[PDB]
Amino acid sequence: SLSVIFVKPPFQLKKKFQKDPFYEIEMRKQLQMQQDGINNMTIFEWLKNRENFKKYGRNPKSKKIQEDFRDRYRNAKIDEYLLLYEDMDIKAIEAMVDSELEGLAALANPAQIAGGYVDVVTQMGNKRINSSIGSQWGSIEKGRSLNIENELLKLITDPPPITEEEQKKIKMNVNLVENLEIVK
């Protein structure tokens, strides 16, 4: 196993998300899923994805994966609502579902700057709370995602070091949710 890496600086619940209590709940939900997404990968895996994202950029395949899911999810929800509430006015249901989907985004767990190069999409989440996380991950040259890689390198290079062979068998171990910082 490995020592926990806490994200530095902590993620922030910005001013405009403090009004409605749903946003706090969602930010934890979303940071969790991104956390779980990293801790599912191996040290070598994560470090490669970050290597590639830095060297070649965003993966064009991922936007298509996501829109394809939206389209499925849209139709899936319509059927759920048709059959659950007995409204056969599929145009009404379609209107309603499309409202919901306006403030929803396919969730890349984790984002691509944060080592999720080839993500498989399966859940929807608040588009804005998702874009807050996404910018707070920072840039390649500076930010929270960088601070995770640097700390993770010191861990593997300090003695007794970790070879690629052992990198491929130790899973990531970050925490993005304990220290969530509510702006004051």
Residue numbers in the entry: 172 to 355
From the publication, what sentences describe this entry?
We identify a horizontally transferred T6SS with Ntox15 family nuclease effector (Tde1) that mediates interbacterial antagonism among Bacteroidales, including several derived from a single human donor. Effectors with novel toxin 15 (Ntox15) DNAse domains, also known as toxin_43 domains, degrade recipient genomic DNA. Cognate immunity proteins are encoded adjacent to T6SS effectors and neutralize their activity to prevent intoxication of self and kin. Crystallographic snapshots of isolated Tde1, the Tde1/Tdi1 complex, and homologs from Phocaeicola vulgatus (Tde2/Tdi2) illustrate a conserved mechanism of immunity inserting into the central core of Tde, splitting the nuclease fold into two subdomains.
Tde1tox exhibited DNAse activity on plasmid dsDNA, which was abrogated by mutation of the HxxD active site (H279A) and strongly inhibited by the presence of Tdi1 or chelation of divalent cations using EDTA. A structural model of Tde1tox H279A/D282A Ntox15 domain was obtained by X-ray crystallography with diffraction data extending to 2.9 Å resolution. Although no close homologs of known structure were available, phases were solved by molecular replacement using an AlphaFold2 prediction model. The AlphaFold2 prediction model was very similar to the experimental crystal structure; mean Cα r.m.s.d. among the eight monomers in the asymmetric unit was 1.0 Å. The Ntox15 domain adopts a globular fold which is predominantly α-helical, forming a short α-sheet between helices 5 and 6 immediately adjacent to the active site. A cavity adjacent to the mutated HxxD motif marks the active site. A sulfate ion is modeled within the active site, likely an artifact of crystallization in high concentration of ammonium sulfate. The DNA binding site predicted with ProNA2020 (38) maps to helices 4, 6, and 7, adjacent to the active site. Coulombic surface rendering highlights relative positive surface charge surrounding the active site pocket, consistent with favorable electrostatics for interaction with negatively charged DNA. We conclude that Ntox15 domains adopt a globular fold, distinct from other nuclease families of known structure, with a structurally well-defined active site that mediates DNAse activity.
